[PDB]
RNA sequence: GUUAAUCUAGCUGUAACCAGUACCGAGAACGAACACACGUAGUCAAGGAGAGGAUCCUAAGGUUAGCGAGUGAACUAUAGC
RNA sequence: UGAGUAACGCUUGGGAGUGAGAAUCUCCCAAACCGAUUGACUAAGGUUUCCUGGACCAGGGUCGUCCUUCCAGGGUUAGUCUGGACCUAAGCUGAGGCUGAAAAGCGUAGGCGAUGGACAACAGGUUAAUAUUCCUGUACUUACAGUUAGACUGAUGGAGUG
RNA sequence: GGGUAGGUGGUAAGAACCUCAGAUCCGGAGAUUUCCGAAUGGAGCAAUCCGGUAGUUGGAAACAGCUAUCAUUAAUUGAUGAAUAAAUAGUCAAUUAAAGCAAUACGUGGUGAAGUGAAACAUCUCAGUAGCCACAGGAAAAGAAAACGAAUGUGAUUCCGUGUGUAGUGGCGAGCGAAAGCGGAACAGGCCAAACUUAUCAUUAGAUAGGGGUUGUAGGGCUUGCAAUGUGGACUUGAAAACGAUAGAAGAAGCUGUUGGAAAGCAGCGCGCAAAAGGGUGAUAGCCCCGUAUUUGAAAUUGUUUUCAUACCUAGCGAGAUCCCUGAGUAGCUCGGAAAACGUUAUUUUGAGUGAAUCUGCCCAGACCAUUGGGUAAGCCUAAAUACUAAUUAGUGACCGAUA
């Protein structure tokens, strides 16, 4: 799927309200990045992680 | 008619009883294939007796199996064997005689 | 328990037959019949004078130890101090 | 060895016509789930004679009682002929 | 492997399992609602004249096309002129 | 009602017999068509429709003693035939995995999948029904054990052939 | 265990048997329970085919009988282990768990139209409906105020009636429709993080396991005291009691005559009733029979409540003092959407970005600011009122009576 695997924050569904307010379904996909991370046993791993969660990890010094 | 075999030696001899009952059960059905089975009622009673004895065995940690621990037929098989011997001898003799 | 038991004397209350004392032979309790010997002979014309069942409601017990051999009802209550359930007449005291 | 693989012998005019030969090809109907080796082993255990050859066939179920407002199906059974040495015979 | 296996060859002996095996296979048993002129892979494929499996009559073999009998008008179809 | 009207959807004659009933059943003699086929062996397909005995309500575009209809009994026999226990093609399925709101989709190792490859049995006889299966005659193949003689054997991999 | 004298399931006779040493039958407990099937040793075209391993019996051996076992995934533990030294991935082994079905009924969540109306139609509507999917539960969901709101006010959630077709929302068209307040059903609120402290970790703990604390008339921690040994549980074990549920037993009372094939009809004379519900009995029976009211009945399994002891949890009130703690990619803010009656608006929610404060705090009282007042988010759980009836038992019907 297109959801990160630190949390389970997946896509979101809404409406594409163009001018004159017509309705069309459209998908908001979270911004996923493959930035690596090191677990506290070694085992540095590459995983697909959302940029917001990347900021969370960065400010907590989990790299 | 059930407690009367709880008292009996419910560990070893019952398998002999079961194999016997199987013997006359098979004989009864084989006679039923032909005529001359004038007491068909025996089959249901003997099957019911097998059921009772198997119940008495299965209440215990046992199984009716694995507890076990021709006059002229051999002559006919013999004659067949030397008949085959003679045929094979003749065949080989002719085959080598051809060469 | 059963009001009528195979082997006892019994008479008919209603029907073309009246006062037909006889011995009962068979009971079909699931369909409430009774085969009384010597009564109700349906003449089968087979390809005989056998009898045919009579309903339990018609039949009624017949006392013999009473001076007046009348017909009365029954009680199952009377239980001997050393025995099991029995039959006893209502307007009398005579077992079975 | 349970001898639950010898259901019944069948006596038909073809069977007799085979009987008045000399091999005395006895026939039986057996448990459909059994095999020829099991059949011959059971025959050895039940009579004491080691057979010469065994042949089997199975009769597929068919429509029975035709059109009778309650038609049924026939029975699936396996027949096992049991040849013997030429000079021997036994009852059944 | 070597204080031997394994293979080849012969001799003696033992064993060889499961499912299909009938019938039709088509102008009456299949696909066409049918005892429907339709369709359905492969194989065998005689004689005479014949290049030939073309054609006609036949051999081996098989069938009596599951409503008939009359008349022989108009008229219809298929032939013949 | 149309109406006892169209239609009855490729062909005969006779003798004898059965039977209550005969053009339609059985036997016999002809006859006419098929005869690169309506002849014989089979694949697939059908699933007892096969054989014997009986019946003629129903079905048979008529009749029926007769039927592929109905009732009763019976009949298919494989170490060598067709397939599996051997092999893979197109393709399918698919541990992990990749991908996708969910269901799921793609795909690796593996595993299946004949319409093909490898693999030992032939002639005759026999019943109403089966026959390279049953029987007679003759053979062949593969395992397994023992024995004898000889020889050092060589794969899950490599190569050739296939 | 009950219950007796007939029974061998229906189309069903017969034959041959069983049965009054207690059958058949009914209730409770059990065992057996082929193959397919989530199917799970491997395949497969479902009910078929082919196996491996470990025992055991026979054989001289393949092999053949008789048993047991062998799917995958996730978690835990152990062993082993490459690119590469270690270490990781991977490999093997042992233990636990679902993995499926249906109650075409309810619940939550994800996704989600059109046909229709607007007398056409795109904004709306139908409708967050139908369908598909995931997750279950006996109900689920929600839930213990950073609340409503205008007050000297109430004080978890849920459901019903009203407020009301109101305020409002709407190509202000079609339409849509509350929240308060009130009257009722029900009623229980507890528990972690955080400081502080004990122990152990190459104690670089930034980690683990204990005690302490769970908040708004702000509370808790820190120092120093006082008073308590209790009431209560959404709570553990047994023992006892009670009422049941799953079979049963007792259980009243009538004759004659006539019509009639048959009386139970009708007539005459009686009787019972805590029993005039029903069904059967040759035509409509309170008294012919089964039952009914009423009284009783449990060896075994099982439900509910009460009592006892019994764990586990639960406990009030003072003085000091600028000491510390009170849930951060969080609240807000920008750009796009949505839920709320609102068609994007205070309130709530989020895809992208941005991003604080710490009791003199922060949020809120339909833009926004000040005053006043209310409440303390960014942690968790919770029975009752509630929705449903495929299933079991009893029963009912101005419900149908064989085109219904
Ligand atoms: Mg044709
Ligand atoms: Mg063809
Ligand atoms: Mg020719
Ligand atoms: Mg031609
Ligand atoms: Mg005519
Ligand atoms: Mg006309
Ligand atoms: Mg005419
Ligand atoms: Mg005509």
Curated annotation (Swiss-Prot), chain A:
SUPFAM superfamilies reported in the protein's UniProt record: L28p-like
Alphabetized InterPro entries for the sequence: Bacterial_rp_bL28, Ribosomal_bL28, Ribosomal_bL28/bL31-like_sf, Ribosomal_bL28_bact-type, Ribosomal_bL28_sf
GO molecular function annotations of the record: structural constituent of ribosome
UniProt xrefs under Pfam families: Ribosomal_L28
Keyword annotations from UniProtKB, A to Z: Ribonucleoprotein, Ribosomal protein
One Gene Ontology term from the biological process aspect of the record: translation
GO cellular component, one term: ribosome
Signal peptide region: none
Region (Disordered): 1-20
Family statement: Belongs to the bacterial ribosomal protein bL28 family.
Protein name: Large ribosomal subunit protein bL28
Record organism: Mycoplasma pneumoniae (strain ATCC 29342 / M129 / Subtype 1) (Mycoplasmoides pneumoniae)
Swiss-Prot record, chain B:
GO BP, sorted A to Z: translation
Keyword Ribosomal protein: yes
GO terms of molecular function: structural constituent of ribosome
Region (Large ribosomal subunit protein uL29): 1-75
PROSITE patterns: RIBOSOMAL_L29
Entry keyword set: Ribonucleoprotein, Ribosomal protein
Disulphide-bridged cysteine pairs: none
UniProt GO cellular component terms: cytosolic large ribosomal subunit
Family matches, as Gene3D superfamilies: 1.10.287.310
Region (Unknown): 76-99
Entry superkingdom: Bacteria
SUPFAM superfamilies: Ribosomal protein L29 (L29p)
Family note: Belongs to the universal ribosomal protein uL29 family.
NCBIfam families reported for this sequence: L29
Protein's name in the database: Large ribosomal subunit protein uL29
Lineage: Bacteria, Bacillati, Mycoplasmatota, Mycoplasmoidales, Mycoplasmoidaceae
Swiss-Prot record, chain C:
Single GO BP term: translation
InterPro entries xref list: KOW, Rib_uL2_dom2, Ribosomal_uL24, Ribosomal_uL24_CS, Ribosomal_uL24_KOW, Translation_prot_SH3-like_sf
Entry's family note: Belongs to the universal ribosomal protein uL24 family.
A single MF term (Gene Ontology): structural constituent of ribosome
Bridged cysteine pairs (disulfide): none
Function as written in the Swiss-Prot or TrEMBL entry: One of two assembly initiator proteins, it binds directly to the 5'-end of the 23S rRNA, where it nucleates assembly of the 50S subunit. One of the proteins that surrounds the polypeptide exit tunnel on the outside of the subunit.
Subunit structure comment from the entry: Part of the 50S ribosomal subunit.
A cellular component annotation (GO) from this entry: ribosome
Identification of the protein by name: Large ribosomal subunit protein uL24
Keywords: Ribonucleoprotein, Ribosomal protein, RNA-binding, rRNA-binding
Gene of this entry: rplX
Any Pfam family matching the protein: ribosomal_L24
CDD domains linked to this entry: KOW_RPL26 (cd06089)
Classification lineage: Bacteria, Bacillati, Mycoplasmatota, Mycoplasmoidales, Mycoplasmoidaceae
Organism of this sequence: Mycoplasma pneumoniae (strain ATCC 29342 / M129 / Subtype 1)
Swiss-Prot record, chain D:
Region listing for Large ribosomal subunit protein uL23, in residue ranges: 1-92
Coiled coil stretches, renumbered: none
Domain of life, source organism: Bacteria
GO molecular function, one term: rRNA binding
Keyword rRNA-binding part of the UniProt annotation: yes
Family: Belongs to the universal ribosomal protein uL23 family.
Subunit structure, interactors included: Part of the 50S ribosomal subunit. Contacts protein L29, and trigger factor when it is bound to the ribosome.
Name by which UniProt lists this protein: Large ribosomal subunit protein uL23
Organism for this UniProt entry: Mycoplasma pneumoniae (strain ATCC 29342 / M129 / Subtype 1) (Mycoplasmoides pneumoniae)
First and last residues shown, out of full length: 2 to 93 of 237
